[PDB]
Amino acid sequence: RYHESVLEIADIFDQADFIQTSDAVRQLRALMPTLSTSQIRHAIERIAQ
Amino acid sequence: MLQQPTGGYTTLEQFAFTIRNDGTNATPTQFLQLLSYEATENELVKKTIPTPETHLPSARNVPGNVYIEDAITQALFGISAQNVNAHGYFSRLSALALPNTSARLGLDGVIYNSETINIPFYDPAAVANFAATYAKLGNASTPRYRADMIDIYAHVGLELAGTDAERAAGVMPVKRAKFDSWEGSLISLSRDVVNWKILAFLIDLCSLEGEALRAFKTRNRDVFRMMLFIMSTAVAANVVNRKVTKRVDRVLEYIGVNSMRTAGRTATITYDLSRHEFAAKFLQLTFTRWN
């Protein structure tokens, strides 16, 4: 009786001032193609300018 | 007239006092607990109080329908009052203590010349003993007669957080108040206390006698503590907010010491310089008469 796939959001702490970001940021990340070193450098430059 | 009820004018119930604990009102007794006390390494000594010079301003009768009761409640608790210490209103009041005067204090708090039918008031004898003592505040401002400030506050503190072994003794360690909060809570309670008809609580603090008094002080020990706290807010210097768990908390920095200004210009109600001149000479009368 097999597994599945979920997320934890680091709710197992209950200590404030940490874990500010939530679940949703991860979902956005696993949607774009895998960025190489030179691509990341380019992407940083573009948003900056 | 309503004559006077024996056991207080505050046992009537038509006019009482309820702090608005957010969406639901409550009683002063019920509110005091939400606050805890932090003993710091500072100490105050209970200093004795000087007598008040007897020389209340003479009688004038300019025609104004003066709201003397409304003015009083405004300065002590009111949010940013203006021209509180001006001379004209009190002088008119002092006419009140005079035996045989066509000038009756309205129940609602407005003073009149002669009288009216449609409006019921307090019997002339109840007000006579009242204005005998609170007319004096009027001239609290004069260079010669003016009252202290940096020292009456050694009493404010014992009452707000006075432990019973502490008001039994003389000295109390400097405390630090902290209680639950709703963000706009300090201003919110100050907006609310302004309508208590604080006249009623005072016009009977001079009429009640030896036994009726012993019972009065032992019941309203809260209605007094309340206006004391809200007043002691403007005075203490630093307001620090603590963000714990999912809660939010307000700390009032030092219950017993006149910082001399500010409190929080935004987080609370502030006292001008013509306020320390007033609230001081006020406490110099209620406290003395109170104990």
TrEMBL record, chain A:
Superkingdom in the source lineage: Viruses
Protein name in UniProt: VP1
Organism: Bombyx mori cytoplasmic polyhedrosis virus
Automatic annotation (TrEMBL), chain B:
Protein name in UniProt: Viral structural protein 5
Parent sequence residues shown: 1 to 291 of 448
